[PDB]
């Protein structure tokens, strides 16, 4: 039960494993995400799918990780968020899991990364001004 | 709330520069805030400094201590720094950091002022 | 210690339950397959390992949807079609007694009229053969629908026969699939997989009994949203087919009048040689040994020990009182009496005849003011269809007695669709996520 | 014949010339990309003109080239997929010319790029933990 | 307009080697442009002396100059330099720089043609 | 008071109050509604 690899190239393969084996195939997911009676439906579902991509483009550019799929930043992790160690984390929970139970404090560290590009922002072009 | 909380060493010789921290919590130095230096002497009335702006970083001094008065900022390590050169007898005195802004949130508008407790400085040999 | 700090990753394997709208794939008719996208040769699956999933049926909103675009398109399909205004005058009819056996005696009427031409001021008579369902007396007779909504004909060219149809997600949305078997369609399902979009779905209309779908992998399988409460039908699917063959043996004749300018509706002329009611037949043993799983099947629910009644339906409209469909064209509406009727105690080449009739203004959908005139097929006609399930109802159910009686149901129509779409459901993805990590920018 | 400059500021005006005098106007072709009978062919037309310009956006982003109209990348070139040398291709043929015979082997090199840009990815956080 | 401007030493030694830049205004070195060097001995034709390719940097020089004659570009500074060696008495001439190209701007289009002024250049001990 | 150019006489004068005016309107008549049918579906409502 220990000491065997395990490798998926589905679209939603590595929904079912861990954390860390689940972060080496962001691409494949990645790749899916922009692609009378019924032609309208068409339209509106094309219209729809544009709309969700711009706006996850958006919001990962303002935070200064644009055109990446892993980038960590300055912000520290607070410890009332959770409290496990990153061996309990990455090596026995799934991704599900850790969305279920993160939920509650999402649009703070959404907040919290904002404010620190900016300031990082204003740092850069201070620094560059001599 | 903006917190402002000042340090630095309590006896500093004649002649000698005098140097102080101020650190602040809850807001960030590089925002659109002033920051200002002020001491009070014993048994007498109170006598501003200085002040500093956190985004420009333009600073003003009073006149009586000018060629001899810095004040600098520090965003990365988010404290504001004092620098007075050539202390005599004369600069014992309690200083104080403190912070006045307006805070315009959408609709409503807030008058918001915080001062440090202040450290006591004693000039002399 | 811990020095942890915020790691964005983009991509990862998480969804959310969602409503959205599904769009067609495909491979004259009233199911319009032109503006429907054609389906890959070779669909993908992909099945998710370790991954159990929430399932419940009787709240998917797929189901609506199903209902709202089947109704959209037979309502657009009959736009360009001829309105029957003029047909609401007085009629004069007599009765059809040559060549008729015992049992169609007085269910044809020999109706004469007037009627207009392509020319505004000239006038024609003419006669044509109705159904005593379609008269109503005022020896003068009109048509039901008269003072309810003038209403049209359907076109003779559009085809009402069922074609399969794939309801495929948009993009950003996927249709999560359980493959779990002995599955009644509510709770845990531990075998998941991701299709592209389901299957082909007939849109098979009927009541009383579920015809030309699709038959359970392991056993008969029972399902009700609270089998406790009487008020909720129950849906069962048979395992195996029951092979059933309806006939209408009338050699009809077909004519057309000219009522305007490029304007015809067709009437029946004669009928050449004699004249019989349509009927059904469904064989005894293999029906036999279908109730016999059925029961065998319901005591788990209902004790091992109860009495276990089949009866006749209750009453109301010819609709919900009887098992209605359409074979080549014309609406039948038949008689499951000889079925249901048994009682079972815990402990050959003939066949059961249904005779049953034949109308030709119909009411589809549950609505009113509208109607579809069907015209008349030339010839007899005759189809052969699978019995794969059955809708029932528990009639009373108090406690005061030790047996149960089941009487079969329908008039809903949505749970037609329903015994198909039941092991789908729709997602939509979450690519951003958010974990502590070591590394610092 | 030799010696003579060649400039060009049209929407397609390098079309004719050769690959490495071609690479010199890419943002002229750049700019142009994104801009009851006739109205709804507008809205169509101008849904399918977003839809490609995301496609190639998100397809150009994988690879790490988000923002850069020249990005050369780590993958080595396989001598299977041509044999000329530099001297013959960018002073001795056209882009039409060469995508008419490289056409063949274009998803190849596409999925070698995401690999590449994945693994390049995971290095840069690995040597960040530290 | 294509700007070309000549500079360096009015003198050079015997047996040195002869320096020579020449600015460009108005056009960037590294487009698609050929700058070409060319001298005038005294009281004599023309002479050719070798160009450059701006874009790719490629460089043809006249097989009498072959192997004393070097020529460069600086797309920063935006200029190229020339560079001859072991200079006799017989290379002192006046040396220009030029460039000759089409301008194909939409409909129309132009040959274009730019020299300078020119330097003289005297070789002797 | 608002107009678009109040010395021309060929634009409306807008007049805005600061308290309303109570109006009280009403009909006394008791009438009667019945309907004729007119064809298949179709009705008619008269005064009766
Ligand atoms: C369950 O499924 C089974 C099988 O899967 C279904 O049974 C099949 O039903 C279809 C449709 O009734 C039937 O196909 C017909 O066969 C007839 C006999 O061969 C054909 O004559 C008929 O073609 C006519 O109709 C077409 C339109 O549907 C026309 O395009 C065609 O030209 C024919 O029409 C001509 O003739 C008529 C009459 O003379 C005339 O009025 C027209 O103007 C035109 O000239 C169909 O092809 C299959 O044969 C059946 N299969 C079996 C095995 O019997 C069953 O119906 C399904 N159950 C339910 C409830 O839907
Ligand atoms: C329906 O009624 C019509 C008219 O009464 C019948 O048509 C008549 O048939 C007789 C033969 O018995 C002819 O002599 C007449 O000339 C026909 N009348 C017309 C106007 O054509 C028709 O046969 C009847 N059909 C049935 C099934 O009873
Ligand atoms: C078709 O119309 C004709 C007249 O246009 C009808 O014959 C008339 O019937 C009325 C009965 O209400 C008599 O009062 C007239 O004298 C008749 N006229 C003639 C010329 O015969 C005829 O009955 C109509 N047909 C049907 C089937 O109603
Ligand atoms: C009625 O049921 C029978 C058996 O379930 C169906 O016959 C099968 O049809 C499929 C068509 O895809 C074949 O692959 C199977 O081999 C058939 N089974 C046998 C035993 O022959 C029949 O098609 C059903 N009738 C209808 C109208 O769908
Ligand atoms: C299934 O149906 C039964 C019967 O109605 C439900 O039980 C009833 O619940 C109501 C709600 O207050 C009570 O008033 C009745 O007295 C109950 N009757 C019996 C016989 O228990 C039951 O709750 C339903 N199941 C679910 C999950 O809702
Ligand atoms: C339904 O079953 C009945 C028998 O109960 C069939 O009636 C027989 O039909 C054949 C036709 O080939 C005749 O030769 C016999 O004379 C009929 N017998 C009786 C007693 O009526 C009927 O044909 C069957 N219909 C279908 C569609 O299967
Ligand atoms: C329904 O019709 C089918 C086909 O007409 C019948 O199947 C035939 O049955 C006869 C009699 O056993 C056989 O000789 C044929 O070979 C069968 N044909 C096929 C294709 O299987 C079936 O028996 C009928 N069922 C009923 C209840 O009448
Ligand atoms: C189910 O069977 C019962 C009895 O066999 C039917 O009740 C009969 O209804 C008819 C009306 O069509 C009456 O004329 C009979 O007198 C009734 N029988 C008795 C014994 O009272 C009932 O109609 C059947 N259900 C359906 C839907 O036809
Ligand atoms: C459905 O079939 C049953 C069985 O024949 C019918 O019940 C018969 O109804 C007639 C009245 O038309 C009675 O005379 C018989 O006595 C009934 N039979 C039995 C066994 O009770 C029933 O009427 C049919 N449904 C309809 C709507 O007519
Ligand atoms: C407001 O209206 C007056 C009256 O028409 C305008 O003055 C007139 O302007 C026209 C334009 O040439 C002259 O022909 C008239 O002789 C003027 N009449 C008077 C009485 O002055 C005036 O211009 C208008 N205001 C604006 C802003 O257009
Ligand atoms: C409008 O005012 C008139 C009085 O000028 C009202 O007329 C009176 O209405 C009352 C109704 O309660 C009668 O009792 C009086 O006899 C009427 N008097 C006269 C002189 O007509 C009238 O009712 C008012 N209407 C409204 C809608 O306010
Ligand atoms: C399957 O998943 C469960 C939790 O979802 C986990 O405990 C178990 O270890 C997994 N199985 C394997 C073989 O890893
Ligand atoms: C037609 O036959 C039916 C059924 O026998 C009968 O009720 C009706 O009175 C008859 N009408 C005639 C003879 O006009
Ligand atoms: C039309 O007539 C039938 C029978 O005479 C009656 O049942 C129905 O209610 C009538 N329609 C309306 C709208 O009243
Ligand atoms: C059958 O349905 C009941 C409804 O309450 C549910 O609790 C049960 O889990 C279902 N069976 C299975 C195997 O999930
Ligand atoms: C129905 O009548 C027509 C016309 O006589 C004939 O051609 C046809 O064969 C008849 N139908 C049957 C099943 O015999
Ligand atoms: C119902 O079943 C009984 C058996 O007790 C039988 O006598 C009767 O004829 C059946 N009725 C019908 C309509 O088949
Ligand atoms: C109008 O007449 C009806 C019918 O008599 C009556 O019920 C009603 O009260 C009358 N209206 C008034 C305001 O009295």
């Known amino acids: 039960a220990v000491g065997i690899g395990a490798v998926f190239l589905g679209f939603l393969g590595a929904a079912g494993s861990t954390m860390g084996a689940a972060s080496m195939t962001l691409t494949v997911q990645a790749r899916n995400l922009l692609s009378t009676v019924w032609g309208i439906k068409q339209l509106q579902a094309r219209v729809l799918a544009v709309e969700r991509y711009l706006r996850d483009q958006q919001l990962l550019g303002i935070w200064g990780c644009s055109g990446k799929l892993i980038c960590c930043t300055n912000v520290p992790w607070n410890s009332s968020w959770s409290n496990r160690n990153l061996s309990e984390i990455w090596d026995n929970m799934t991704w599900l899991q850790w969305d279920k139970e993160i939920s509650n404090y999402t649009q703070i560290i959404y907040g919290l990364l904002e404010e620190s590009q900016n300031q990082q922002e204003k740092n850069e072009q201070d620094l560059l001004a001599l | 709330q903006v917190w402002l909380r000042e340090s630095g060493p309590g006896l500093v010789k004649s002649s000698e520069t005098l140097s102080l921290t101020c650190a602040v919590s809850g807001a960030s130095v590089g925002g659109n805030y002033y920051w200002n230096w002020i001491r009070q002497f014993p048994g007498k009335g109170l006598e501003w400094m200085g002040n500093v702006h956190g985004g420009s970083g333009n600073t003003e001094y009073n006149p009586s201590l000018k060629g001899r008065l810095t004040i600098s900022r520090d965003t990365s390590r988010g404290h504001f720094l004092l620098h007075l050169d050539s202390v005599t007898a004369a600069d014992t005195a309690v200083?104080?950091?403190?912070?006045?802004?307006?805070?315009?949130?959408?609709?409503?508008?807030?008058?918001?002022?915080?001062?440090?407790?202040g450290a006591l400085v004693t000039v002399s040999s | 210690a811990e020095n942890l700090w915020v790691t964005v990753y983009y991509g990862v394997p998480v969804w959310k339950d969602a409503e959205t709208t599904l769009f067609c794939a495909s491979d004259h008719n009233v199911w319009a397959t032109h503006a429907c996208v054609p389906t890959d040769p070779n669909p993908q699956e992909i099945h998710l390992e370790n991954v159990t999933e929430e399932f419940n049926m009787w709240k998917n909103n797929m189901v609506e949807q199903m209902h709202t675009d089947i109704i959209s398109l037979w309502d657009q399909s009959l736009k360009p079609c001829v309105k029957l205004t003029p047909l609401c005058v007085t009629l004069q009819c007599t009765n059809v007694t040559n060549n008729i056996t015992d049992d169609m005696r007085g269910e044809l009427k020999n109706c004469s009229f007037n009627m207009t031409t392509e020319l505004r001021d000239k006038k024609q008579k003419v006669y044509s053969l109705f159904y005593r369902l379609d008269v109503v007396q005022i020896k003068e007779y009109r048509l039901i629908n008269c003072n309810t909504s003038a209403c049209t004909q359907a076109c003779p060219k559009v085809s009402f026969e069922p074609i399969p149809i794939h309801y495929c997600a948009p993009a950003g949305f996927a249709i999560l699939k359980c493959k779990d078997k002995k599955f009644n369609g509510t709770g845990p399902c531990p075998s998941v997989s991701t299709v592209q979009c389901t299957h082909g779905i007939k849109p098979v209309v009927s009541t009383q009994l579920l015809l030309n779908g699709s038959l359970a992998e392991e056993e008969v399988m029972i399902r009700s949203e609270n089998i406790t409460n009487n008020a909720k039908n129950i849906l069962v699917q048979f395992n195996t087919p029951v092979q059933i063959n309806c006939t209408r043996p009338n050699n009809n004749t077909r004519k057309s009048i000219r009522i305007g300018p490029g304007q015809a509706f067709y009437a029946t002329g004669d009928i050449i040689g004699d004249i019989r009611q349509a009927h059904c037949n469904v064989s005894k043993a293999t029906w036999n040994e279908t109730l016999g799983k059925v029961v065998k099947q319901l005591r788990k629910h209902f004790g091992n020990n109860t009495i276990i009644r089949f009866a006749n339906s209750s009453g109301g409209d010819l609709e919900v009182t009887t098992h209605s469909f359409n074979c080549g064209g014309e609406f039948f509406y038949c008689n499951t009496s000889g079925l249901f009727n048994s009682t079972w105690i815990s402990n050959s080449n003939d066949s059961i005849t249904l005779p049953c009739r034949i109308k030709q203004i119909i009411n589809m959908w549950q609505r009113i003011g509208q109607c579809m005139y069907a015209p008349p097929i030339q010839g007899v006609i005759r189809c052969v269809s699978n019995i794969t399930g059955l809708i029932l109802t528990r009639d009373g159910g108090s406690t005061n007695s030790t047996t149960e009686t089941f009487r079969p149901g329908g008039g809903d129509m949505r749970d037609n669709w329903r015994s198909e779409l039941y092991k789908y459901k729709v997602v939509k993805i979450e690519p951003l996520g958010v974990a502590p990590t070591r590394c610092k920018r | 014949a030799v010696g003579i400059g060649a400039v060009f500021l049209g929407f397609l005006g390098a079309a004719g010339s050769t690959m490495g005098a071609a690479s010199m106007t890419l943002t002229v072709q750049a700019r142009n990309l994104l801009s009851t009978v006739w109205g709804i062919k507008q809205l169509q037309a101008r849904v399918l003109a977003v839809e490609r310009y995301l496609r190639d956006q998100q397809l150009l982003g994988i690879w790490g080239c988000s923002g850069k109209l020249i990005c050369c990348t780590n993958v080595p070139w396989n001598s299977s997929w041509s044999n000329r040398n530099l001297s013959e291709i960018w002073d001795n043929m056209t882009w039409l010319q060469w995508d008419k015979e490289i056409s063949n082997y274009t998803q190849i090199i596409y999925g070698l790029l995401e690999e590449s840009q994945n693994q390049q990815e995971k290095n840069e956080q690995d040597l960040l933990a530290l | 307009q294509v700007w070309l401007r000549e500079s360096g030493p009015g003198l050079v030694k015997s047996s040195e080697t002869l320096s020579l830049t020449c600015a460009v205004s108005g056009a960037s070195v590294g487009g698609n442009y050929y700058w070409n060097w060319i001298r005038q001995f005294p009281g004599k034709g023309l002479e050719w002396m070798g160009n450059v390719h701006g874009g790719s940097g490629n460089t043809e020089y006249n097989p009498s100059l072959k192997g004393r004659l070097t020529i460069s570009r600086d797309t920063s500074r935006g200029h190229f330099l020339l560079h001859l060696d072991s200079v006799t008495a017989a290379d002192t001439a006046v040396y220009y720089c030029?460039?000759?190209?089409?301008?194909?701007?939409?409909?129309?289009?132009?040959?274009?043609?730019?020299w300078g002024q020119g330097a003289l250049v005297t070789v002797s001990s | 008071i608002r107009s678009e150019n109040i010395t021309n006489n060929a634009k409306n004068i807008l007049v805005q109050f600061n308290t309303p005016v109570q109006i009280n309107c009403t009909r006394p008549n008791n009438n009667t509604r019945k309907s004729i049918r007119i064809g298949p579906g179709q009705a008619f409502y008269a005064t009766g």
């Open positions: 030029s460039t000759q190209y089409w301008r194909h701007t939409g409909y129309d289009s132009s040959f274009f043609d730019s």
